[PDB]
From Swiss-Prot:
Protein name: Phospholipase A2, major isoenzyme
Disulfide bond entries: 11-77, 27-124, 29-45, 44-105, 51-98, 61-91, 84-96
Catalyzed reactions: a 1,2-diacyl-sn-glycero-3-phosphocholine + H2O = a 1-acyl-sn-glycero-3-phosphocholine + a fatty acid + H(+); 1,2-ditetradecanoyl-sn-glycero-3-phosphocholine + H2O = 2-tetradecanoyl-sn-glycero-3-phosphocholine + tetradecanoate + H(+); 1,2-dihexadecanoyl-sn-glycero-3-phosphocholine + H2O = 1-hexadecanoyl-sn-glycero-3-phosphocholine + hexadecanoate + H(+); 1-hexadecanoyl-2-(9Z-octadecenoyl)-sn-glycero-3-phosphocholine + H2O = 1-hexadecanoyl-sn-glycero-3-phosphocholine + (9Z)-octadecenoate + H(+)
Species in which this protein is naturally found: Sus scrofa (Pig)
GO cellular component, one term: extracellular region
EC number per UniProt: 3.1.1.4
Cofactor(s) needed by this chain: Ca(2+)
Entry's localization field: Secreted
Residues the record lists as binding Ca(2+): 28, 30, 32, 49
Chief location of this protein within or outside the cell: secreted
Subunit structure: Monomer or homodimer.
Post-translational modification: Acylation causes dimerization.
């Protein structure tokens, strides 16, 4: 889940908006835009999309509804660091593995908070 990994992304970042620091950042980060990224940090957003989708196809989840942003979450947060769920099949826990390894790209990565806000011309 996206709104549900977001609440813990704004603990991951000491922080404020879990996206919008990302929605408009390079090309897209997390939410918005289309194509390919800019940063190492923006690469976990090319793939929080490429391993975010596949919940639709899944070994455990293959029907109608869950396509871009929805399945998981039942978490925590410490310093900055959380957990993910407390239930699991792949349906929730596979989607949770790309969400939390994106809270690890998104709290930390080879970060740059620098090309925020962008335009998608120079940027994408
Ligand atoms: Ca994105």
């Amino acid at each position: 889940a996206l709104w549900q990994f977001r609440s813990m992304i704004k603990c991951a970042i000491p922080g404020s908006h879990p996206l919008m620091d990302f929605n408009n950042y390079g090309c897209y980060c997390g939410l918005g835009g289309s194509g390919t990224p800019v940063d190492e940090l923006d690469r976990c957003c090319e793939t929080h999309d490429n391993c975010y989708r596949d919940a639709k196809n899944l070994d455990s989840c293959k029907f109608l509804v869950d396509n871009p942003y929805t399945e998981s979450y039942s978490y925590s947060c410490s310093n900055t660091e959380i957990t993910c769920n407390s239930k699991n099949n792949a349906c929730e826990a596979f989607i949770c593995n790309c969400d939390r390894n994106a809270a690890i790209c998104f709290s930390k990565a080879p970060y740059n908070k620098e090309h925020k806000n962008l335009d998608t011309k120079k940027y994408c």
